[PDB]
């Protein structure tokens, strides 16, 4: 019921072709001049967006029919599916536990006589994960309406099947996209260790330097002794080469192959050391390569259930494909981002004792791991908020709690990147419960 | 022959060395050539 639809609907024609052919002499279209129906081919060949009624040439009143219905079937997957960690049938929340190494104390027998039972808690850190996704793919199918379009059950039925498959495609595409979201999210928070590099999709010198950084970084991640600099939680973590995954994209893949590997006699000396898992790219500005541990992803499924119902009045089925899942990232897993353009001097101040519980009047030592992106030092300022008059923290991170404290506290680690006119107060933060002691009171103490 | 690149160099460089064989108004240069690519460094 659209009426005057042109065959040129939406065609941003670059020159024509018919004119080109008929006006071709030694203009390369001369090979088409001998063709008897070239013009008709030119008119239709591109494909028709909207069917218009076509009459039979022999008998005007007859209508030419559709002699073939081709229902395409596409099936899409999830490139990152392999990073799914399973299912959590029951229980919503996941708890990760990680024990950080201890410190070396100098041997001192004298002092030891008053410290035998000192009691020193381990550097244990935990992290929680939680079911985050909960949505569904709603698809309605008006069976009998579709029946007036089709003239064959093979076509009709397969069409419907395709619709249902589209639901599943929708699901996996989005799942993939959510995993990407997690990367851009983690980045937007500033939790990746940032390795700045010159753009690798330009001069091969940039590409080369990039590759070196990738191989070197991979090795650094896998060093036997471990390191804190690749871990968002700033704990000594050791990785393994076979557990590293390098995401990057199709551009870099091609750049490496052609410019480097094609010439390399020893390709294993310039390839990537981890498991390369090419994706379409990231949204974050300048975010390119991402190198992470296979356990960085904390993706678990909670629900995959197709629900259906038929509306008896409005003839149609509804399909509700429910997808619930835990979408999160481990901060204990190693994670490095390679970034092109300019980044902050400090992307993340990390306070070690995220959760503390200092009894009224006591003390707690804090540690900051200012995630600098360069060689410049970045003095950090300690402060406390929500605290009483006597609660304060030493410039070295040593927190002193008031003898009358009661309010839950928070401790900040501030690093100013910017300047006087526009300071860039990068802040790390930790919280402290008081669970106050007793048996005191009075005056003078 | 000390090649020096202060930076801000995005073009491939050609390093040549010549010897003037012949005479005045007859510079029959003999020339050697090295290929220099540039690796970015902020």
From Swiss-Prot, chain B:
Disulfide bonds: none
Subcellular localization(s) per the UniProt record: Virion
Reported function: Assembles to form a prolate capsid shell of about 54 nm in length and 45 nm in width, with a T=3, Q=5 symmetry.
Similarity comment: Belongs to the phi29likevirus major capsid protein family.
Oligomeric form and interacting partners: Homohexamer. Homopentamer. The prolate capsid is composed of pentamers and hexamers of the capsid protein.
Protein name from the UniProt record: Major capsid protein
Organism, as annotated: Bacillus phage phi29 (Bacteriophage phi-29)
Residues of the full protein shown: 400 to 441 of 448
């Amino acid at each position: 019921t659209f009426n005057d639809v042109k065959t040129s609907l939406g065609i941003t024609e670059s020159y024509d072709i018919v004119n080109a052919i008929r006006n071709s002499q030694g203009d390369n279209f001369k090979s088409y001049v001998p063709l008897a129906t070239a013009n008709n081919v030119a008119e239709v060949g591109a494909g028709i967006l909207i069917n218009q009624t076509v009459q039979n040439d022999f008998i005007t009143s007859l209508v030419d029919r559709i002699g073939l219905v081709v229902i395409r079937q596409v099936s899409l997957n999830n490139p990152l599916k392999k990073f799914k960690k399973g299912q959590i049938p029951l229980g919503r929340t996941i708890e990760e536990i990680y024990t950080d190494i201890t410190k070396e104390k100098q041997y001192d027998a004298e002092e030891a006589e008053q410290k035998v039972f000192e009691r020193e808690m381990p550097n244990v850190k935990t992290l929680f994960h939680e079911r985050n996704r909960q949505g569904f793919y709603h698809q309605t199918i008006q069976d009998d309406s579709l029946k007036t379009a089709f003239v064959s059950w093979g076509n009709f039925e397969s069409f419907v099947s395709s619709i249902i498959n589209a639901i599943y495609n929708s699901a996996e595409v989005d799942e993939y996209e959510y995993m990407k979201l997690l990367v851009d999210n983690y980045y937007s928070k500033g939790l990746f260790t940032t390795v700045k590099i010159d753009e690798p999709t330009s001069s091969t010198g940039a590409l080369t330097e990039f590759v070196k950084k990738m191989r070197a970084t991979a090795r650094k991640l896998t060093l036997p002794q471990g390191s804190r600099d690749w871990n968002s939680m700033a704990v000594r973590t050791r990785s393994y080469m076979e557990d590293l995954h390098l995401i990057i994209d199709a551009d870099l893949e091609a750049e490496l192959d052609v410019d480097v590997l094609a010439k390399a006699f020893n390709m294993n000396r310039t390839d990537f050391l981890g498991n390369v898992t090419v994706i379409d790219g990231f949204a974050s500005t300048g975010l390119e390569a991402v190198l992470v541990d296979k356990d960085w992803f904390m993706v678990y499924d909670n629900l995959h259930k197709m629900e259906t119902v038929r509306n008896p009045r409005g003839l149609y089925w509804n399909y509700y494909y429910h997808v619930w899942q835990t979408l999160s990232v481990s901060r204990f897993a190693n994670a490095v981002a390679f970034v092109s353009g300019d980044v902050p001097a400090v992307t993340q101040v990390i306070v070690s004792p995220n959760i503390a519980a200092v009894k009224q009047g006591g003390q707690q030592q804090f540690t900051a791991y200012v995630r600098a992106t360069n060689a410049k030092d970045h003095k950090v300022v300690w402060s406390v908020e929500g605290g009483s008059t006597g609660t304060a923290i030493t410039g070295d991170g040593l927190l002193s709690v008031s003898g009358n404290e009661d309010n839950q506290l928070t401790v900040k680690a501030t690093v100013d990147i910017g300047t006087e006119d526009k300071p860039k107060l990068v802040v790390g933060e930790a919280v402290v419960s008081i669970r106050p002691n007793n048996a005191s009171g009075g005056a003078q103490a």
